[PDB]
Every structure is written in C-alpha cells, then in structure tokens.
Amino acid sequence: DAWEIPRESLRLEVKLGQGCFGEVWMGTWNGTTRVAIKTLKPGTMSPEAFLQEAQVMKKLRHEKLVQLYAVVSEEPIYIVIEYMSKGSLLDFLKGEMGKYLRLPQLVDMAAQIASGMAYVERMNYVHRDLRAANILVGENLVCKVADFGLARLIEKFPIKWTAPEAALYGRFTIKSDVWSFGILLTELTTKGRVPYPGMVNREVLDQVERGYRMPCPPECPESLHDLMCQCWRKDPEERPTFEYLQAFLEDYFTSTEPQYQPGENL
C-alpha cells in the first residue's frame, strides 16, 4: 500500500529503548524531517503480526495520538512515526522535570490523554494497554497516546492497570480502557509511582475483586479521586465515557475545584 517507503529515505541515529520485538531509534526521514523508528530483530516476532500494530495506526489520525508516517514492510522491518521529544510520560513524571509538575499541568496532561482516548472511543477501538509508559511527551507538555501493539477494533496483561473483567475473562472494551485511565490518574498524581504499593499481582486481583480501591493520593483533591472511583466501578458499564472525562478535565479548575490552591507537591 501507499504507506510503504524505501529504506534509503530514512536514517537511524540515536537508540532509545529495547524490547523483545526489537529496538527504537530516533532519526531523520527524506533527510529533512525528524522521526522515530520501531525496528524488529532478525525475525524475533511474527512478521505479519508485527505490522498489525501499524495496520491499526493507519486508520487512526488525531492530534493526541502518535501519528504513523511510513512503513518498511520488507525485511528488515520498520515502523516510522512522529517524534516525541520528551520521551515517555512515566520517565517524565519521575525524572528531574517531574518534581515541579503541579495539579494544573497534570490535569492538563490528563485532559489531552482523555481527548486522545475519546477519539479512540468514537472510532470504536480499544487500546488495551493504557498507562503512563504508553504515553509520549512532546514539547510544550503535549501528551500523545502510543504503543498500539494490542489495539483492536471492537469485535499476561499487567493486572495493576487492567480492569478485572478484562484480566479474568478477556473482556476488553473502551470501558476497560476507562479503568486503566483511572489508574493512569494515580500515576499522574503520585509523580509516577506504581499503583497498589507493596501489593503483588495476586494480592491485587484478590483485593480488587473484594472491592478494595486505592485511597486519595496525598494532596489530590477528593473530586479528582471520586473521578478515579467512577473509573473503577465494578460494572464496566457504569464507568464514564472518555468524552465526559475529557470535558470534566479540561474544565476542572473552573467547574469542580475553583478553590484549588497549590500545595507542597500538587
């Protein structure tokens, strides 16, 4: 198809991350544009299924999603994307710039993810792996949803982010995505800490089933934690939409916490 490109048009430069798929490099494309490239290693993952990520990226275009640019479908295999200068949200949150983030910038970042996910929502897709590690940060604190490896049109998984019904019964929906967004809201409010501190996977599964939910993070306003609790409702279906989350987050400091004053950490 028309996404395909020749190898030579590219050039890889700096290396960025490593996984059991391959590598991630920064680079330039047609020697004029700054790009990012997700390599494969000598056929370590199934070739047809590896490009099933980009297959999905092809049909999604939104300002708050990492934009596909090009593909080299002929071995050695690649996937080329827009470049996100500030790396992953998880690294950002716990790194050196992370400590000066306050509630208004963190709420603004949540708003953007929600805006990106609301688009997924109206496109009838499911992300399946929504979390801080899967969001990229650009310049001006812009945040975009990434790592569509598992995204599906609506037709193991780290239970700490994954809704109960999806971890147990493989029932992934946009509403399981909502659940992960609730956990993503805790990573934002704690500068990037792992949820369910000191709890191990099976401890998390057993406790969540019995209705345990993480408490208000320190200095997080109750109204933001209430939103978290809504996202973690037992019935997938009583959970709010992204569209609602987007709108509630964008308007937060006027409609919900107009009395917010900056604290020690948030």
Curated annotation (Swiss-Prot):
Protein name listed in UniProt: Proto-oncogene tyrosine-protein kinase Src
Superkingdom as given in the UniProt entry: Eukaryota
Domain Protein kinase positions: 10-253
Entire-sequence positions represented here: 258 to 533 of 533
Organism: Gallus gallus
Known tissue expression: Expressed to high levels, and with a high degree of kinase activity, in certain fully differentiated cells such as neurons, platelets and macrophages. Isoform 1 is widely expressed. Isoform 2 is expressed only in the muscle.
Record localization: Cell membrane; Mitochondrion inner membrane; Endosome membrane; Nucleus
Reported function: Non-receptor protein tyrosine kinase which is activated following engagement of many different classes of cellular receptors including immune response receptors, integrins and other adhesion receptors, receptor protein tyrosine kinases, G protein-coupled receptors as well as cytokine receptors. Participates in signaling pathways that control a diverse spectrum of biological activities including gene transcription, immune response, cell adhesion, cell cycle progression, apoptosis, migration, and transformation.
Family according to the record: Belongs to the protein kinase superfamily. Tyr protein kinase family. SRC subfamily.
Oligomer and partners: Forms a complex with polyoma virus middle T antigen. Interacts with AFAP-110. Interacts with GJA1 and PXN.
Post-translational modification: Dephosphorylated at Tyr-260 by PTPRJ. Phosphorylated on Tyr-260 by c-Src kinase (CSK). The phosphorylated form is termed pp60c-src. S-nitrosylation is important for activation of its kinase activity.
Keyword Ribosomal protein annotated: no
Modified residues (Phosphotyrosine): 169, 260
GO biological process: cell adhesion; cell differentiation; epidermal growth factor receptor signaling pathway; immune system process; negative regulation of extrinsic apoptotic signaling pathway; negative regulation of intrinsic apoptotic signaling pathway; progesterone receptor signaling pathway; regulation of cell cycle
One annotated GO molecular function: protein phosphatase binding
